[PDB]
Amino acid sequence: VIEHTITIPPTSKFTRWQLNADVGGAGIEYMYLIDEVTPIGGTQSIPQV
Amino acid sequence: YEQIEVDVVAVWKEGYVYENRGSTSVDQKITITKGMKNVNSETRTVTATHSIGSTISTGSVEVSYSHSHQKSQVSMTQTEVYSSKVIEHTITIPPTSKFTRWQLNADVGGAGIEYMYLIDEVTPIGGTQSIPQVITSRAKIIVGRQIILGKTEIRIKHAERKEYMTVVSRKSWPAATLGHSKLFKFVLYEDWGGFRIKTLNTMYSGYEYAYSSDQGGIYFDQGTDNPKQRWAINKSLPLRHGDVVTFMNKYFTRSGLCYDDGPATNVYCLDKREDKWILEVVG
Amino acid sequence: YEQIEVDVVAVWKEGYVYENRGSTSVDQKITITKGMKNVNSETRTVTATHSIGSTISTSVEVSYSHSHQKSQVSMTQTEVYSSKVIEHTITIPPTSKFTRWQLNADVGGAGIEYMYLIDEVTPIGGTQSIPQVITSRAKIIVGRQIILGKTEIRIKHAERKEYMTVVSRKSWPAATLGHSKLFKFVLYEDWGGFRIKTLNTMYSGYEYAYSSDQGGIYFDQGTDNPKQRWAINKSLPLRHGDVVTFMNKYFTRSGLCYDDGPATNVYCLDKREDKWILEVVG
Amino acid sequence: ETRTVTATHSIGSTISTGDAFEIGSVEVSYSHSHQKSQVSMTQTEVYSSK
Amino acid sequence: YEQIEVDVVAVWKEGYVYENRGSTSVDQKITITKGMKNVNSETRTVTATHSIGSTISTGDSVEVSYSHSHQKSQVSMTQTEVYSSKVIEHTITIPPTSKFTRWQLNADVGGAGIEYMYLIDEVTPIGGTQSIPQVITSRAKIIVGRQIILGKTEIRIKHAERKEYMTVVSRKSWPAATLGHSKLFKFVLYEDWGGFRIKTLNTMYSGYEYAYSSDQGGIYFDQGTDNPKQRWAINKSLPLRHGDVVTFMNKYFTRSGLCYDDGPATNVYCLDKREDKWILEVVG
Ligand SMILES: [Hg+2]
């Protein structure tokens, strides 16, 4: 079980991207979580890879 | 690394409005839960039964005696996998204030990815409500290395099973089956007839293009024009690392590349079936 | 982007009134929950028995038998669950009444609804005001319009979350569900109703979705046939992301749906009418 | 909704004697059954609480 | 806006005593729970079986048998669950050299026919001799419903458990009682020396208006006779008031009372050992 508690300030957006990381050659892999709080607006940046 | 700009288009899925009309504030907590469980069992029973009977016979009198012996053996294997995402938001809604939750489903164009999109706001009561049924916005997407058709070498991974497409020998032909080996490379081609999956690890030279037998099994053939060794993709080009793709057969239009537990191999092409595959560029 | 003004109409569903007449305050916490669980299983049993009997008779009779049963149950289960829990914590002051009204709010024209909750604390006394139905105004931000005859769309099965595609069954083009994002359509209306036209047929001119006499969906040449004509659930305009229903103009009881048939899985069956999402292509 | 389908195959046989002098007889039976069974279940739950 | 003064008699049901003899204090939490759950299911099964069989034999030996069966089964289930809880939780700090006592009694309010749970907690120093209440009488003022004047005030009759109203329909060309959602079916109650009578105001056959029990149990509406079959005994003392929970026992068939049962075409009956609860509501 993994739990994250964050305080989101007003007029802000929260981002969670979950990637699966593949370590090359080693043949191992891990879960990769990216959390971010930014102000509302701008241009969204999404990591596909 | 390259970046492409797209529109994200989010569509309303659900809503909620709450009004606190009083002069004391209120503490609101919303918990949203989604989860899944998968159970598989195999139960093997064996019973052995022995019976010895007899009848003594001669009005008329009959006498019967009977004896039963049953031995039984049940072997059970159950296996469970579960997951849950729980998501909770707690807010203090001030007096004479109105809280709105809108939940939309956001589709990222081109990327073939989607995400849940929640908009919360507290405002004073009054004005008129603004509901977003459909929202368009812009996004930069950090994208994978491009799969150059004909050139770049890739692995094909079954999405659900997390095993790779491997070449083995069935009926004296090279044939597709799922395995753990990271050694089986491929290259993808497009022509007038569709897409072609070429293996670089065939045990019979020249027999390298993936194709469907009239039975469904995937074999690897020599290069012909036959639509049986051609395939329809699910996406628009370019293909990139990590892309979730589908291969529908160009001749057997009803059917696509899937996993089935067949007699010898386990990669087939069957009506109403198209499992997702993950393409990954080798280093 | 366009934005339409509309009335939202909410009708009373449920209510609750709490009076704290005491001279100490009370901490009240109302907590509401709705949830779903869907369970699916397939159980395969294979069972094999061999018996050898024997009787010697003359009188006296003597029997002996032996059986060997070998059985194999294979079951696989799928569970999918969800819930929404809403908690509210308030301090009701001394000599105060708390009232909660729960309404169901229908947004006109848009075909979407939401839960509307009204909490209020006031002094004890006055006349209770109960909202059985409230109308209010809303501006709704809507999707790009699906212009009939013109704009290219995808048709997605709402429940199965996969797309409507064209494949060959018995040498005609036929509808099946697929993962491909490459199967486009254009919608037409004339005085006979709505028509679904595929831009991805493998046999030219055969492009209008129609119901066979068995129920399967194929694509025909444009005729006047009511069997190739469809009744939607909302009125115009159609927009991106609209949830729609396709009922057949000919077999009036039946509508476009999923069913696991022999070769394809898109059908037109009595009493069934699945929901589809229309997406305007980028 | 629970849907069950069962296919069953049985082959049986008896070898016996009688009026074969020394009065009295021996009988011998043999049978084999294969049964194949598929059950499909759909369950849906809806719950609430205040 | 009528109010009547009366005694409530509360009677001991359960007790508990705690002594803290130490010189540090203690934090005590009593927590009591009552609940119910009702489960209702319906399971419909349909099995179709085909069997094809055969035997090849010799006479004047060897026998050879073969059979095949195909069996199709369809099981449909509907389950209904409904539940409730009440939890009462008390937290107290008992100081040192202190005794805590809890008495639970059950209070019966006289005349009104309502009851409530009555809890008495007390912390005192250890010593003295205990006072235990077995039964306590106290006075109370009851704010009561608008009165049902017999012969005059129009009332409706609600099944307490099912929350549906007694309505009048036509069964076998007679006015018959059935349960239904209509707030349109009004009644008026009468008492004479024979007992109590239910008169409908919504009969479709004029004059056939007083509730009676047929020889099979069903509730019909007859002309006003002297027949004890159209008379009923109530559970409460007079007067009847809006919101009163009542019983109707038949004056003729004394073992039987007015109840719900799922019958051939109607569902309001008069059956042995059954007496359903009814709520009486004064119309506007
Ligand atoms: Hg269907």
Author numbering:
A (entry chain G): 100 to 148
B (entry chain H): 9 to 66, 73 to 297
C (entry chain I): 9 to 66, 74 to 297
D (entry chain A): 50 to 99
E (entry chain B): 9 to 68, 74 to 297
According to the publication:
Based on the crystal structure of the monomeric lysenin, five negative charges were removed from the proposed transmembrane region (Glu84Gln, Glu85Lys, Glu92Gln, Glu97Ser and Asp126Gly) to create the mutant RL1. RL1 still readily forms stable oligomers in the presence of SM-containing membrane and successfully captures and translocates DNA strands under an applied voltage potential. The homogeneous RL1 nonamer was crystalized and its structure determined at 3.1 Å resolution. Two nonameric oligomers were present in the asymmetric unit, packed in a head-to-head manner. The RL1 nonamer reveals a mushroom-shaped transmembrane pore with a central stem built of a long β-barrel. The bottom half of the mushroom cap is composed of the C-terminal domains of each protomer, and the upper part, named the collar, of β-strands originating from the N-terminal domains. The β-barrel is located in the middle of the oligomeric assembly and is built by nine β-hairpins, each resulting from the unfurling of a significant portion of the N-terminal domain of each protomer. The height of the pore is ∼11 nm, of which 10 nm belongs to the β-barrel, with the widest dimension of the cap 12.3 nm. The inner surface of the RL1 channel is mostly polar, with negatively charged residues framing the top and the bottom. If mutated residues in RL1 are modelled back to their wild-type counterparts, the inner surface of the channel becomes almost completely negatively charged, thus neatly explaining the reported exclusivity for the passage of cations as well as the inability of the wild-type lysenin pores to translocate DNA.
